[PDB]
Design a protein around this ligand. Structure first.
Ligand SMILES: *[C@@H]1O[C@H](CO)[C@@H](O[C@@H]2O[C@H](CO)[C@@H](O[C@@H]3O[C@H](CO)[C@@H](O)[C@H](O)[C@@H]3O)[C@H](O)[C@H]2NC(C)=O)[C@H](O)[C@H]1NC(C)=O
Ligand SMILES: *[C@@H]1O[C@H](CO[C@H]2O[C@H](C)[C@H](O)[C@H](O)[C@H]2O)[C@@H](O[C@@H]2O[C@H](CO)[C@@H](O)[C@H](O)[C@H]2NC(C)=O)[C@H](O)[C@H]1NC(C)=O
Ligand SMILES: *[C@@H]1O[C@H](CO)[C@@H](O[C@@H]2O[C@H](CO)[C@@H](O)[C@H](O)[C@H]2NC(C)=O)[C@H](O)[C@H]1NC(C)=O
Ligand SMILES: *[C@@H]1O[C@H](CO)[C@@H](O[C@@H]2O[C@H](CO)[C@@H](O)[C@H](O)[C@H]2NC(C)=O)[C@H](O)[C@H]1NC(C)=O
Ligand SMILES: *[C@@H]1O[C@H](CO[C@H]2O[C@H](C)[C@H](O)[C@H](O)[C@H]2O)[C@@H](O)[C@H](O)[C@H]1NC(C)=O
Ligand code: NAG
Ligand code: BGC
Ligand code: GLC
Ligand code: GLC
Length: 850
């Protein structure tokens, strides 16, 4: 047929709900053409398939409103035949539209609200929204490409994509750039060890699409229901959600970093972590007493390994229950944590969401009080839904209930009164259930058995979690499931603020869009494998683009047994995770830095030492994330979008604009090949911290670098200045040391950098102005600071070393504030000028040479 002449790559599936025969396909009013070898749909929509018609388009002060009408039913039940379209032109960068049922309030995700670069026009029949980039006329969105479906439990909205390059749609084990070859991406939070093609712990319905020439846009669908996102190679995308409404934001960039910042303007800028949170964290399942746990710190200390935060897993609890500690191995738990604090370290422990429900009445306050106050998710007969997790039978708190929030704050404060822990590791908050749904199964209804089930592991919404039709304060679990973790992270953030009075530190397994405003994330139960080491790079980068910059993987891997070589390379790379924790499973061989051979220990110690030297810089990068929606770890394409060679690179990463990390990610290698964008890149090993080229002069090219077992390649971009600080086994110690600058000159002698400094943990620092901020500038053989703000926290900072890279000629003299310096060295082979000074970050200085 004429209408069935649709190019293969542009066929949209008219049988996404079930296996179909040719006769049934045709009776739907669809085209049946088998592919010649999910894949390309054999049953697909002709361009005439019934959609909605636009009627009564009107122009308001905020934008546009219209009615959308479907005349012919779809093959799903409960089509909503009359919809309302609202288009809001919110800023020059942000376009917002919604499609709703004007006759019924439908579930919506709870969220605080925050010439243009876009234009918008509409197709009448079939209905579509078309968004152009005004500067070049590129079509960014065109929803005319397939029918709009809007049924009670099935929404589908499709669009063309501007290129084959698209990233986002966490959480999945994938390259940073997603495959457009008939790929079904499922968002349904699920406790499963990361494996390819699976819905994992978190769900972020946001994508960033690259455009030829290096501009980009982003799209956020504000919808928390179970969904599939289907990418096809035309290229095009289909959102398929199981409930809610279509609430769509388009972010115009044009730069990828701006797209990310614009997205974070809606969902929230990243929270500012405490400085100590950027130190090394060490944990395992199996530190089964305070004595053993104390030995970890002792063993790290004796072998000169920095450690800011000691953790415990389930070991601490009384019979694996929250807000208890056993009176055998952990009898003296309070004293252990007090002692940690006396030495300048912090303490973290695991908290699960589910609460043991099986104890005698009156014997377990978290449950007894939860029951009294009605804090738990309830079932059909109004009683707590009971599942099974680590303690046995458990009820599940409803973190959408304000009373549950108050209860959680209370349980956290009461436990903190016994043991003064410094944050919360919130696990199992998908929510995870070791049985299907509940001890009593689940009822048979349309929420438990919906007409479209996304491609979830196990083929049901109840698999490894609770019943979809269970009740929460705001809605059913069906609607709220993908928010469970997020809502717990918000509750825990608030609880920690109230209990401790300083910045919270929450690390969560499950996440949703906006998570980064409250908490960080670790990537869960990764294997100790070379595969998963390599896969951690794109995953950490992905979460940075999603505004969760406090992210990392379990260093050396969680599951199975690490090898020495793997743990060296994983420690080297993982020292560049913004959140750095080595964590290990119960039955695995030990993998603490001190448990390896001497050469391995040296390499691991070096990795940790370099991280601690860089902490002032890392902290400043977090400040930029927090105040301007920047990324901390970023892919090369975020920083060099106009170099199309960067677009598929995800085994290198940047810290901010200027530090390029090129890890070895394979066994047996003593070299690595990395992409170097146009520029001069100085080898960071030429900066004295306490055939290798000193500078890579790149045109935009791949470069093979020596990378023996003791080495990770780290390069500093010309034009940038990096603040550093002296060593310590903790940040309590390190923050008191002298600082240094590493100054990477351009060929013309230019560089710029910055330092942000506050007390490291107080609330409302920016609001109160309790911070110091300094800019550094190199120009014409001088280095100066520029004092943006100087306060008490910052006025003691001693600058004792200035290292200048790319100094072509040996200076005859070096001056600090007009006075010849006590000592400097120049190396003619590396072009490094190293200068001892006695200066203050917060007082104006001028260092010069000639
Ligand atoms: C809603 O959740 C409640 C729990 O909060 C469920 O209560 C459970 O109901 C089952 C029977 O439907 C009870 O099983 C019975 O146990 C007794 C011994 O204790 C035994 O003699 C019976 O033969 C039967 O096995 C179960 O004890 C009870 N759970 C608790 C903790 O009391 C209720 O069934 C749930 N409703 C729905 C519709 O799922
Ligand atoms: C598109 O809009 C027209 C006109 O709407 C007008 O009347 C409605 C009831 C409101 O008061 C609105 O503000 C007015 O602009 C709709 O056509 C009208 O529908 C009424 C109810 O069915 C009829 O009684 C009326 O005769 C008719 N008016 C005209 C001029 O045709 C039309 O239904 C609407 N289309 C859709 C799909 O909603
Ligand atoms: C948006 O997508 C639609 C559908 O792919 C495009 O509309 C088609 O345009 C061709 C000519 O290019 C016509 O022959 C068809 O009749 C149109 N189809 C439909 C269903 O209307 C449209 O061109 C796209 N718009 C933009 C601006 O790219
Ligand atoms: C801390 O280090 C000590 C010393 O290396 C470890 O103690 C040894 O443990 C092994 C068991 O694996 C014994 O064979 C040795 O005899 C022990 N030596 C001493 C001197 O006690 C200890 O296991 C380490 N603890 C932790 C928690 O890592
Ligand atoms: C992780 O290791 C433990 C213990 O392994 C023991 O035997 C092997 C062969 C080595 O020699 C170790 O040094 C020794 O301690 C195993 O019991 C466990 O199965 C293993 N895990 C996996 C996934 O293989
Ligand atoms: C660099 O400084 C010297 C004075 O110390 C001056 O002669 C020269 O013009 C300066 N260069 C520029 C570009 O300002
Ligand atoms: O995707 C291809 C599949 O489509 C289904 O709807 C058909 O029933 C199958 O025969 C076919 O293999
Ligand atoms: O179009 C019917 C079917 O065709 C084929 C595709 O692999 C499948 O995804 C689709 O459902
Ligand atoms: O608490 C026991 C285990 O629970 C989950 O599997 C966590 O992902 C893991 O890190 C932890 O060790």
């Amino acid at each position: 047929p004429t209408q069935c002449d649709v190019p293969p790559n542009s066929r949209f599936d008219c049988a996404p709900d079930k296996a179909i025969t040719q006769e049934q396909c045709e009776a739907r009013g669809c085209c049946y053409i088998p592919a010649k070898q999910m894949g390309q749909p054999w049953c697909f929509f002709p361009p005439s398939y019934p959609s909605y018609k636009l009627e009564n388009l009107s122009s308001s002060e905020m934008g546009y409103t219209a009615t959308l009408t479907r005349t012919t039913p779809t093959f799903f039940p409960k089509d909503i035949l009359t919809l309302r379209l609202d288009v809001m032109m919110e800023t020059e960068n942000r376009l917002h539209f919604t499609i709703k049922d004007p006759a019924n309030r439908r579930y919506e995700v709870p969220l605080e609200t925050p010439s243009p670069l876009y234009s918008v026009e509409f197709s009448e029949e079939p209905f579509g929204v078309i968004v152009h980039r005004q500067l070049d006329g590129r079509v960014l969105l065109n929803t005319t490409v397939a029918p709009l479906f809007f049924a009670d439990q099935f929404l589908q909205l499709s669009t063309s994509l501007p290129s084959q390059y698209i990233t986002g749609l966490a959480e999945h084990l994938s390259p940073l750039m997603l495959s457009t070859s008939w790929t079904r991406i499922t968002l349904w939070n699920r406790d499963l060890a990361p494996t390819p093609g699976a819905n994992l712990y978190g769900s972020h319905p946001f994508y960033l699409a690259l455009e030829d020439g290096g501009s980009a846009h982003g799209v956020f669908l504000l919808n928390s229901n179970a969904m599939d996102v289907v990418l096809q190679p035309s290229p095009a995308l289909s959102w398929r959600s199981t409930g809610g409404i279509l609430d769509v934001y388009i972010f115009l960039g044009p730069e990828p970093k701006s797209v990310v910042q614009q997205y974070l303007d809606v969902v929230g800028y990243p929270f500012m972590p405490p400085y100590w949170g950027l130190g090394f964290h060490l944990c395992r399942w199996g530190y089964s007493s305070t004595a053993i746990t104390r030995q970890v710190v002792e063993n790290m200390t004796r072998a000169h390994f920095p450690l800011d935060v000691q953790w415990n897993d389930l070991d601490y609890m009384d019979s694996r229950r929250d807000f208890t500690f056993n009176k055998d191995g952990f009898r003296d738990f309070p004293a252990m944590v007090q002692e940690l604090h006396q030495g300048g370290r912090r303490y973290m422990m695991i908290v699960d969401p589910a609460i043991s429900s099986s104890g005698p009445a009156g014997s377990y306050r978290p449950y007894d009080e939860g029951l009294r106050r009605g804090v738990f998710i309830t079932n059909e007969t109004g009683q707590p839904l009971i599942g099974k997790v680590w303690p046995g039978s458990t009820a599940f708190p409803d973190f959408t209930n304000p009373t549950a929030l108050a209860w959680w704050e209370d349980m956290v404060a009461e436990f903190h009164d016994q043991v003064p822990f410094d944050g919360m590791w919130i696990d199992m908050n998908e929510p995870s259930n070791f049985i299907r749904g509940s001890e009593d199964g689940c009822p048979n209804n349309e929420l438990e058995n919906p007409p479209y089930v996304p491609g979830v592991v196990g083929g049901t919404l109840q698999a490894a979690t609770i019943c979809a039709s269970s009740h929460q304060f705001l809605s059913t679990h069906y609607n709220l499931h993908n928010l469970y973790g997020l809502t717990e992270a918000i509750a825990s953030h608030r609880a920690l603020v109230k209990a401790r009075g300083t910045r919270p530190f929450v690390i969560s397994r499950s996440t949703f869009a906006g998570h980064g405003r409250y908490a960080g994330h670790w990537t869960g139960d990764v294997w100790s494998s070379w595969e998963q080491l390599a896969s951690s790079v794109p995953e950490i980068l992905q979460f940075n683009l999603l505004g969760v910059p406090l992210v990392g993987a379990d260093v050396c891997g969680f599951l199975g047994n690490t090898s020495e070589e793997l743990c060296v390379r994983w420690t080297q790379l993982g020292a560049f995770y913004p959140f750095m924790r080595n964590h290990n499973s119960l039955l695995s061989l030990p993998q603490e830095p001190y448990s390896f051979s001497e050469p391995a220990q040296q390499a691991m110690r070096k990795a940790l030492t370099l991280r601690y030297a860089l902490l002032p810089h890392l902290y400043t990068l977090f400040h930029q994330a927090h105040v301007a929606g920047e990324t901390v770890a970023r892919p090369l394409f975020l920083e060099f979008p106009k170099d199309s060679s960067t677009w598929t690179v995800d085994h290198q990463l940047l810290w901010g604009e200027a530090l390029l990390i090129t890890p070895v990610l394979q066994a047996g290698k003593a070299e690595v090949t990395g992409y170097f964008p146009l520029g001069t890149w100085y080898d960071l090993q030429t900066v004295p911290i306490e055939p290798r080229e000193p500078a890579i002069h790149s045109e935009g090219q791949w470069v093979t670098l020596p990378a023996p077992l003791d080495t990770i390649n780290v390069h500093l971009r010309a034009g940038y200045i990096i603040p550093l600080q002296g060593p310590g086994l903790t940040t309590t110690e390190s923050r008191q040391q002298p600082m240094a600058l590493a100054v990477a000159l351009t060929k013309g002698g230019e560089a710029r950098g910055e330092l942000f400094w506050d007390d490291g943990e107080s609330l409302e620092v920016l609001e109160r102005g309790a911070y110091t901020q300094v800019i550094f500038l190199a120009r014409n053989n001088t280095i100066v600071n520029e004092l943006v703000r100087v306060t008490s926290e910052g006025a003691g900072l001693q600058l004792q070393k200035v290292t200048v890279l790319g100094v072509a000629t040996a200076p005859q003299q070096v001056l600090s504030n007009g006075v010849p310096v006590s000592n400097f060295t120049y190396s003619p082979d590396t072009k490094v000028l190293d200068i001892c000074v006695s200066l203050l970050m917060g007082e104006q200085f001028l260092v010069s040479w000639c």
